[PDB]
Curated annotation (Swiss-Prot):
Transmembrane segments: none annotated. The DNA replisome assembles sequentially on oriC in this order; DnaA, DnaD, DnaB, DnaI-DnaC helicase. Monomer with a very minor amount of dimer in solution. Interacts with replicative helicase (from G.stearothermophilus, called DnaB); this interaction is disrupted by DnaD. Interacts with replicative helicase DnaC, forms a DnaC(6):DnaI(6) complex. Interacts with the helicase as 3 dimers. A stable complex with DnaG primase, DnaI(6):helicase(6):DnaG(3) fragment can be isolated; DnaI and DnaG do not contact each other (helicase and DnaG in this complex are derived from G.stearothermophilus). Residues 1-106 are annotated as: N-terminal domain (Nd). It is found in: Cytoplasm. Disruption phenotype: Essential, it cannot be deleted; in depletion experiments DNA replication slows as soon as the protein is degraded and replication stops by 1 hour. This is Replicative helicase loader DnaI. Induction: Transcribed at constant levels during exponential growth. The gene is dnaI. The N-terminal domain (approximately residues 1-136, Nd) interacts with helicase DnaC and has a Zn(2+) cofactor. The C-terminal domain (approximately residues 137-311, Cd) has ATPase activity. The ATPase activity of the Cd (not whole protein) is stimulated by ssDNA; Cd has a cryptic DNA-binding site that is masked by the Nd. The CTD binds both ssDNA and forked DNA. Belongs to the DnaI family. Helps load the DnaC replicative helicase onto single-stranded (ss)DNA and simulates the helicase activity; in the presence of DnaB more helicase activity is seen. Regulates DnaC helicase activity, at low concentrations stimulates the DNA helicase and ATPase activities of DnaC. Has no measurable ATPase activity after 1 hour incubation of 6 uM DnaI with or without DNA. Another group has found the protein has weak ATPase activity that is not stimulated by ssDNA. It comes from the Bacteria. Zn(2+) binds at residues 67, 70, 84, 101.
Length: 106
């Protein structure tokens, strides 16, 4: 009833960096596309892979999920316009590839 080795002990190393870290960590695990991709490739992806590819997954959700080739969102700065970003597992790292907007097909 009395855990002698309580793991609830914060390491003294906690700069504002960790505040970003925990924020983005949650933010990534808060996006709907991420949920779908996670379970899609959960057999391949590991927890650590997520934290390693954190930057990618966070940049993924932060950018335009859609594209102006379909949406009238002119306020979204897209350079890979005509495409949409999707996550892909490449070895031990998760990358962001663009697939062509299906709206190009009628
Ligand atoms: Zn589109």
């Amino acid at each position: 009833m009395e855990p002698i080795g309580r793991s609830l002990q914060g390491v003294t190393g906690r700069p504002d960096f960790q505040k970003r870290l925990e924020q983005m960590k949650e933010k990534v695990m808060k996006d709907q596309d991420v949920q779908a991709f996670l379970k899609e490739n959960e057999e391949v992806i590991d927890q650590k892979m997520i934290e390693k590819s954190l930057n990618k997954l966070y940049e993924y959700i932060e950018q335009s999920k859609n594209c102006s080739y379909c949406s009238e969102d002119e306020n979204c700065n897209n350079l890979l316009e005509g495409y949409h970003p999707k996550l892909v597992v490449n070895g031990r790292s998760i990358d962001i590839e663009y697939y062509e907007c299906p709206v190009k097909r009628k």
